[PDB]
Symmetry: C3
Subunit: 114 residues, 3 copies
């Protein structure tokens, strides 16, 4: 899986350990091995959410499966929780787009997962 | 809705108020209230379009609905117009990818939409 | 087509000709003229892959067609090869998401390709 967070919160506000925590928490949440989890945090972005430049985040989670109604609610609680606690971003200023990737459309190490 | 523009134009060339204008104009164009609209502008990027490093932009618009043939033509006219007028990017050096998101695949405020 | 690479490799380690090399190689691989190809490289990113911050890349390739099981297996070899040689990234620390875009969902030059 791959999780990306884009935020206007400054780099200095991203705690040491955050990438590791996202990796571990996402491994738990998706049930996929941590070695397959990629995480990408992009601070200091020029962003607005609802016209306001208060802290916000635009995120994506891509996974081959493990994406769906109840699962995505669980991920959103988890991930908004982490963004609120670690980056001090209000959950109502976060969007997370979820993508259920076909294995044939995910490349890795000179092939795909199909 | 979420609009992202990645461009090689420098940050200093992005006019004051650009994210506000994008918010307002996208609210009008999509019919969604501006509170729902998130905008993300990423200048100074290392990019090429057609092998040329002249000003260009790669953009995305994600929305739960309000995506379709005629609508996307209208968004393209609007958005290319703004990138041309405000960032001085030729419309023929802009790609905009449109994504119709299922509500269940959009997280917000500790949960997802439906 | 549009190819994006996000990587923790530093900017100074991205060769000046990489965007052009990618443009040319992707034109050959997709069978699309290079004028249609846009490339975006984002270095210096805060990323981890499998919980490690050794060099890695998260990439996407969007195209109106020319996307599919066999083609994506081929693109992965092409792109892993380029990332390994030019950016010194191990191919097992590369993900590439492939997106077959509907022409109606790709904006360009004030309109879409529909
Ligand atoms: O569910 C998975 N999703 C992966 C993914 C999806 C989209 C983008 N990038 C990566 S990689 C992976 C490797 C092994 C086992 C499961 C997975
Ligand atoms: O106007 C509203 N905006 C909302 C929203 C959703 C996502 C991002 N930003 C804002 S959710 C909402 C709930 C109840 C009543 C009004 C609203
Ligand atoms: O049209 C909407 N799209 C939203 C969206 C889509 C994709 C990514 N991020 C946000 S937020 C929203 C909230 C309530 C009612 C409509 C919408
Ligand atoms: O295959 C193509 N894909 C293009 C694309 C797709 C997704 C995102 N950005 C660009 S642009 C294009 C122009 C003319 C003829 C073919 C194409």
């Amino acid at each position: 899986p791959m999780f990306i967070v884009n935020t206007n919160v400054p780099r200095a506000s991203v705690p040491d350990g955050f990438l590791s925590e996202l990796t571990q928490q996402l491994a738990q949440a998706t049930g996929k091995p941590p070695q397959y989890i990629a995480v990408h945090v992009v601070p200091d972005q020029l962003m607005a959410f609802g016209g306001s430049s208060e802290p916000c985040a635009l995120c994506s989670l891509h996974s081959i499966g493990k994406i769906g109604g109840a699962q995505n609610r669980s991920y959103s609680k988890l991930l908004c929780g982490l963004l609120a606690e670690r980056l001090r971003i209000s959950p109502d200023r976060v969007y997370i787009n979820y993508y259920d990737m076909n294995a044939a459309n995910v490349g890795w190490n000179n092939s795909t997962f199909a």
